[PDB]
Symmetry: C2
Subunit: 541 residues, 2 copies
């Protein structure tokens, strides 16, 4: 008879400017002060019970590692299984709750983050992960808010995708959550990513065990508390920080695992994938694994490029948040003709880059890298840049962990386009440059595509429109997010759905309309309204 169908008008959350005297800048400075010298105690949360184990851990401020910003603990096997059992017992009612009621919780949480809780969530991201004002703002506010709103819009509008009905039967599709629990494993670099890893599956009718990154615990728990206050029922998302391997071992051993939503390193993702496969016989259904892993991303420059855009775009992409983004540019390809100009502008602007404490000094461009293990790995690369004959440091190269894990932005030139530093992901502020002969730009395009294992992000700078069209074809699979005359970072929800293939992951494109499909197992229902009839057919009579 009738089909009734609902839509949702959503806009991207406006990014505030935070200038002198603005209300948001005053709010944020009060939120920062309310944090200096205080250490939050963060329990595991299972259902509504706050739980503590004997395995206490601390989260320290990256630019001042003497300040413990949070104290939390690791779930044991016992607690993780209690969490699984309780999540499973809450699932059927949650899955049965209409998508509009579920969406409403995430819309309210988005509004809480947008206004009243904004400064708090910005402040905890700045202090706990080492983000500057603007990095915390585009992440912990804008992207997280946009995930909640746009995924709610997409889930609501998915209900309207219904099959054809033909008399005497009516057909309908019911978007079921996966049967079991989902494990969400989030990384340090984005506060928004934890929110979406656990949030998107929960929105789609799943129950979730969320293991947040130890180095983002302060802000992750702030996200969790907001969702609970926005109305998320108990046992829909369990907050269970844990040792990585123990968590991985436990959830891939449960017969009830129906999914893993992972962001982080390729080896850890492959390992989880292998564990699930080793145990395939015990699962009640086939577990869905989604993985967003790293990249070795590029800015490729043609002789026609606008040099100023190349310069500011590459500095932002390589060095914002210390180059600690899956999308950060770490290999730059420059034509011989343009190199002297670009090298000079880069070196001049590099010298103007202030690294320091992002809460005390808002003039800070970027701050310390996240932790000691990261700091060490980066120093070994710096030492490798001096040691290697094919490599010379053009700028930076110093690092100082006496107060925070501080690394100077570093620019390295490579004479060898296949050097390990052009291929392996550093996750620090280290930009590698290869200068190529103008006459050999077509072959250098092939090098970009062929050099690494990754296919996450990439950019082309060219004013020549025919060269753009050409590189677009050649690099089709070298980057899941491809940028033309823009930096390789800063994907905005609903505008650049994000992810890539090759070794960079399963490319489910969070931030787009199709991402949520991974988290539903649709049922089709056919109802027939008239009596069936003879089992024989006419052609048989």
């Amino acid at each position: 008879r009738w089909k009734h169908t609902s839509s949702l008008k959503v806009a991207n959350e406006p990014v505030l400017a935070f200038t002198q005297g603005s209300p948001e800048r005053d709010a944020l400075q009060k939120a920062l002060k309310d944090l200096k010298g205080r250490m939050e105690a963060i329990p595991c949360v299972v259902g509504d019970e706050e739980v503590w184990t004997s395995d206490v851990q601390y989260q320290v401020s990256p630019f001042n590692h003497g300040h413990k910003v949070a104290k939390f603990c690791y779930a044991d096997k016992s607690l993780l299984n209690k969490a699984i059992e309780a999540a499973l017992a809450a699932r059927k009612e949650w899955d049965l709750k209409p998508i509009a009621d579920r969406a409403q919780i995430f819309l309210k949480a988005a509004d809480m983050l947008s206004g009243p809780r904004r400064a708090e969530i910005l402040a905890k991201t700045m202090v706990g992960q080492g983000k500057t004002v603007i990095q915390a703002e585009i992440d912990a506010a804008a992207e997280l808010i946009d995930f909640f709103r746009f995924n709610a819009k997409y889930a609501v509008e998915l209900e309207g995708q219904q099959p054809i009905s033909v008399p005497p039967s009516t057909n309908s599709t019911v978007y079921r959550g996966l049967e079991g629990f989902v494990a969400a494993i989030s990384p340090f670099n984005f506060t928004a990513i934890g929110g979406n890893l656990a949030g998107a599956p929960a929105l789609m009718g799943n129950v979730v065990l969320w293991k947040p990154s130890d180095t983002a615990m302060l802000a992750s728990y702030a996200v969790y508390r907001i969702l609970r206050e926005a109305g998320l029922p108990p046992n829909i998302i369990q907050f269970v920080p844990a040792d990585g391997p123990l968590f991985g071992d436990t959830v891939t051993s449960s017969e009830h695992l129906c999914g893993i939503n992972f962001t982080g390193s390729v080896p850890t993702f492959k390992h989880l994938w292998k564990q699930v496969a080793q145990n395939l016989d015990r699962f009640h259904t086939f577990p869905r694994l989604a993985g967003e892993c790293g990249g070795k991303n590029f800015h490729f420059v043609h002789r026609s490029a606008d040099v100023e855009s190349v310069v500011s775009g590459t500095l932002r992409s390589a060095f914002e948040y210390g180059g600690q983004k899956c999308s950060a540019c770490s290999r730059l390809y420059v034509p011989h003709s343009l190199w002297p100009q670009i090298k000079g502008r880069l070196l001049e602007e590099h010298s103007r880059i202030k690294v320091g404490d992002p809460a005390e000094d808002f003039g800070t461009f970027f701050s310390a890298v996240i932790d000691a293990k990261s700091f060490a790995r980066i120093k070994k690369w710096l030492e490798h840049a001096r040691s290697s004959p094919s490599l010379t440091i053009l700028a930076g190269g110093k690092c100082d962990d006496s107060v925070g894990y501080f690394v100077e932005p570093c620019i390295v030139e490579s004479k060898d386009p296949q050097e390990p530093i052009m291929k392996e992901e550093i996750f620090g502020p280290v930009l590698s440059v290869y200068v190529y002969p103008d006459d050999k730009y077509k072959e250098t395009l092939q090098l970009v595509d062929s050099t690494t294992s990754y296919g996450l992000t990439g950019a082309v700078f060219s004013q020549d429109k025919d060269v753009v069209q050409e590189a677009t074809k050649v690099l089709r699979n070298a980057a899941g997010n491809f940028y033309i005359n823009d930096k390789s970072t800063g994907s905005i929800v609903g505008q650049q759905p994000f992810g890539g293939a090759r070794a960079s992951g399963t490319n489910d494109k969070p931030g787009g309309p199709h991402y949520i499909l991974r988290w539903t197992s649709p049922q089709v229902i056919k109802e027939t309204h008239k009596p069936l009839g003879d089992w024989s057919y006419a052609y048989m009579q």
Copy 2:
């Protein structure tokens, strides 16, 4: 700016009635005669080269196993690798061809199947797989034609799903095929399924190695030849029958595997999944595995049911095409109050069921089972139905493999609702019945949900509208295709997208608008039209 876009309106293929004197019935009888006593020689096809190996195999007519209907051969490791290398070299140009041009091939193949080639494809399915006229019609014509048309509509309209653009940038999504080759492994029971397993990925810009079922070779190759004549370029689909394990071992060993599209048994699917995981390190990207496996499907009857619909619906579901459908009903739950009436009507109608040669006698309801291995397995079940104390054969129980693999439709009553015959998939014409006490119908609903490992199809017969709403809730995850007062078979494309979870597979819903998404890896492109600006931010001044 502005773009030229397009959409596709399509309609289901009408199912012909094939009555005396109708044009389709005369065409089909000529096509059957043109097949009696002839044996088609079927090569492997790599690119455009017909290739023969020393490993010759035969396909025989199931109802007359003395008639060899086709002679074909198995690809060796060598040929499979030649086929991989050649597919890969054809991929980029094919992926780059616009979706409208690729869709056009499948639309033309659908029209060929619909008219000129219909009788031929029906006839080869009847003769090679043992299908009756109407089973061949709803499968090799209607469903296959619908897959081609509806997937083409869905792929064309997917292009229209584009992200938000905000000045000074324009965003676009490019639906890339997977990078590598896809392996398509099809089963005997549906001719349409081979078409879609290899056809849907190819449509989305992939290159495919198709291993067709040895027992469906005649009709599968007829589908393949039609696609090629409709315009499919060489090396987009390689026709490569092979030994199952050798094929599985070869493709899971190629660094270039990017997907497996599988239909068949759970254990073979799990095995492929484990092989892919064991080899994760070698692949250039993460292979997507889609699996449609079996079911142990139910018809549940409430005391309010229309008895005639239950009877004809159950007979059709259990016994059409010999009960060799992933969706066939093989467990029936009946209330004590209704049993005498239903048992009597069933037994009466059972006695009117004609089993025989479907080409010589159109009065045949169903024919022989597919092959000797299947025939044996089914006999072992029949012997189990006598032997078991909990089990008594109410009807049929004879089988005769002297001329074809003929099994009488069999009805077994179980006193034990957890008996192996209520749980394990037979893939033959064997219906198990459990009679339950009316007062215990709520708990019996739970038994349906809890008894097996599968979640494929299921049906509820009830005139009581409140009982329907209740069973719908209780059984939400017991069936991916759920039927209310209709048989548990006969999913029509675009009306009941088909598949289920639990052990029944990955539930990607072929026949729906989302299935094709498994076969694309989207790229987002952002172009910025104005110069970038300072790398510093205002708040930093």
